[PDB]
Symmetry: D2
Subunit: 131 residues, 4 copies
C-alpha cells in the first residue's frame, strides 16, 4: 500500500474537499508571492466538532529537481468544541490560508488537505519564475 492510493483529486466545482490554489502564473525572481489555498471554495465544507478540515499543506517541486519541499503546514484547530458541549464553543477556524513564498526557480505548487473523516485530497499548479 502506497499513500497515494488514498490521496484523491477531483474537480472543485463538483467536490467540496478539493484544495483550490490561487497563485500568479509568473513571478519575478525572489519576489514575495501570495499563495491562497481554500477547501470548500465553491461547494461549502462543514466545520463542526464532528466533521471538519484539519489542515492544508503546500509543497513546491522545482523543475528538474528530484524532490518536493514542504512550504508549510497550516492547521485549522478550532471547531466549536467546548466544556459546555460540541458545537456551542466560541471559535471556529475555516480552511482558508494565505502563505507567502519567495521563489528563485520555476516549479509546481502542490496543495494537500486533510478532512477528519474524508481523508486526503490534492491539487497542483505550475508557477514560472523569471530567470
Amino acid at each position: 500500500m502506497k499513500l497515494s492510493d488514498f490521496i484523491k483529486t477531483e474537480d472543485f466545482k463538483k467536490e467540496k474537499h478539493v484544495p483550490v490554489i490561487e497563485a500568479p502564473e509568473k513571478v519575478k525572481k525572489d519576489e514575495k508571492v501570495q499563495i491562497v489555498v481554500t477547501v470548500g471554495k465553491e461547494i461549502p465544507h462543514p466545520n463542526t466538532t464532528e466533521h471538519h478540515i484539519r489542515w492544508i499543506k503546500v509543497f513546491f517541486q522545482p523543475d528538474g529537481d528530484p524532490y518536493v519541499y514542504e512550504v508549510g503546514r497550516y492547521e485549522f484547530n478550532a471547531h466549536g468544541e467546548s466544556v459546555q458541549g460540541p458545537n456551542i464553543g466560541a471559535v471556529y477556524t475555516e480552511p482558508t490560508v494565505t502563505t507567502v513564498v519567495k521563489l528563485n526557480r520555476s516549479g509546481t505548487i502542490i496543495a494537500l488537505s486533510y478532512c477528519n473523516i474524508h481523508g486526503l485530497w490534492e491539487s497542483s499548479q505550475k508557477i514560472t519564475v523569471e530567470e
Copy 2:
C-alpha cells in the same frame, strides 16, 4: 521553570521578532474574520537556512472562559536548504499568515511565534463580537 519565563514581548517598532496581529476591532456574530499575523513586520527578520522564523500560532481566549483555544499553527518550512548547499535552494516561506475564523463571543486574540535561535515571542489584541 515556567514556559512564560521564556516568552518575550516587545514593541514591534523596536524588535523584529514581535508577531504583529492585524484583525478588526469588532465583528458580527459568526461572520468570517481575517486575521493576519506577521513577524518582521516593520523591522525585517532573516530567512536563511541557519536563522529563520519557524511558525506562528494563534490562540483565542473567550471573555469569561477559563481557557485558550488554539485557532491554528502555521508553519513556514522552506528556508533555502538544498542538496547543492544551504541558502541556494529554490524556495523560502516568509513568516506571514492569513487565517480566517468565525467567532461567536468576544475575546482576545493571542499570537505566539518561534525563531529557530531566538525563542518565543507573543502579542495580543482584543476583539469584540456582536451579541
Copy 3:
C-alpha cells in the same frame, strides 16, 4: 493578556491534564536520551471525538541561555471520528509520546500540552549533561 495567564500547572496525582515527563536525571554529552511525556498518566483523560488531548510539545532551555528551543511537537490526531459517526471510527491516538534527543549542555525540559476543551498545561524537569 499574556499566554501564560492561560497555561496551568498542577499535580498529576490530582489533575489528569498535567503532562508528565520521564527522562534521566543525568546523561553523557551527545548521547541519545529518551524523553517520554504522557497526559492522563495516573488519572485517565478521555479520548473521544468531542474531548481529547491534541498535542504535546517539548522545549529545552539550556542553562545560562536566553531562549527556549522547540524539541518537537507531537500531535495525536485520531479520536474515533468517522463518516459512520463520532466515536465509532477505527482508530484513536493516545496522548503518549517518546522522543529522543542528544544534548550537549545542561538545561531544563519543559512539556506543554493542549486539550481541545481544557486549554494549555505544563510541567518541567532539570537534566544535567556531562561537561
Copy 4:
C-alpha cells in the same frame, strides 16, 4: 503532477531515508499498541542545521474503508542551531518516535517522513485487530 510522484520507497537496508515501522502483527480490540517509527534505522541519517529529518507522520488505513486517518504528526525541531552559530547549539532531536494507538478494526499503518533536502519517503505494514 501528483504528490506521489515525489514520495519514494526503498529498502531501509540500502537507503537511510526510509521510515521503518515497528508494530505488532496482531493486537486485541481497543488495546494500546506501541508504534515506533525511525528514520536512519540501519543506515544513519545526518542531523545538522543544514540537513536533517523534519518529521514523521503516521496514517491508518482501515480495511474496506475509502480513506486514511492521520494518527499523528511528530516533528523533530532541534538541529544544533544557535545564535553562536549553526551546529554548536545545545540540543538535537533525533528522527525516532513512539506513538500509542487503540485500534478496533484491522488495517494498514503508513509512515511518511520528510527530509529538509531529500523530500518525502514512505513505508507501510499491515496490522490485524481481533474482531
